[PDB]
Curated annotation (Swiss-Prot):
Organism: Thermus thermophilus (strain ATCC 27634 / DSM 579 / HB8)
Classification of source organism: Bacteria, Thermotogati, Deinococcota, Deinococci, Thermales
SUPFAM superfamilies: Ribosome recycling factor, RRF
Keyword hit for Membrane: no
Protein name: Ribosome-recycling factor
Family to which this protein belongs: Belongs to the RRF family.
MF annotations from Gene Ontology: ribosomal large subunit binding
Length: 185
């Protein structure tokens, strides 16, 4: 529990929050040209719920299409019977070792539901990050008094915490803003 460990810990927590944010975003139907959209899809295979990637591959040739390659011809069948079963509203077609799935332009209804969701997640990210700064500063207050650090030493430590905070805020914004541009595409 030293200044150095305080920093490491602060950077660690913020990093975890940034990941929770990435997750919340990747779980959104962008311009939908994303292949990761279908990665988490648990597909029923041999009575088990195996994620699609371990059972198939999905690449995004052009920004309007999505292809799903399945090594197993049978798995490909059930992958299609799973791609749907969601708000995704996709229509895969059976052709060869892969399913062809066109991504239709999204309705300005779910487009609302998407840009709003992104911004909601973004602020949730910042709130978490500012709260982490808050906890780090509280710990710095006790640590400084406890270790009798100089005004310059403690103010320097505050500056270090402040610097870590702004990097993740900046990075959080960049993530959100990028997903926003994908959705408004």
């Amino acid at each position: 529990m030293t200044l150095k460990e305080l920093y490491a810990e602060t950077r660690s927590h913020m990093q975890k929050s940034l990941e929770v944010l990435e997750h919340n975003l990747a779980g959104l139907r962008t311009g939908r040209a994303n292949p990761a959209l279908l990665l988490h899809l648990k597909v029923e295979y041999y009575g088990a719920h195996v994620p699609l990637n371990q059972i198939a591959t999905v690449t995004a040739p052009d920004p309007r299409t999505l292809v799903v390659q399945s090594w197993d011809q049978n798995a490909l069948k059930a992958i299609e019977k799973a791609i749907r079963d969601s708000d995704l509203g996709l229509n895969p077609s059976n052709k060869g070792d892969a399913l062809y799935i066109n991504i239709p332009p999204l309705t300005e209804e779910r487009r609302k539901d998407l840009v709003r969701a992104v911004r909601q997640y973004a602020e949730e990210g910042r709130v978490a990050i500012r709260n982490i700064r808050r906890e780090a500063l509280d710990k710095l207050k006790k640590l400084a008094k406890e270790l009798h650090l100089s005004e310059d030493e403690t103010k320097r430590a505050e500056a270090e915490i402040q610097k870590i905070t702004d990097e993740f805020i900046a990075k959080a914004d960049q993530l959100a803003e990028k997903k926003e541009q994908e959705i408004l595409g």
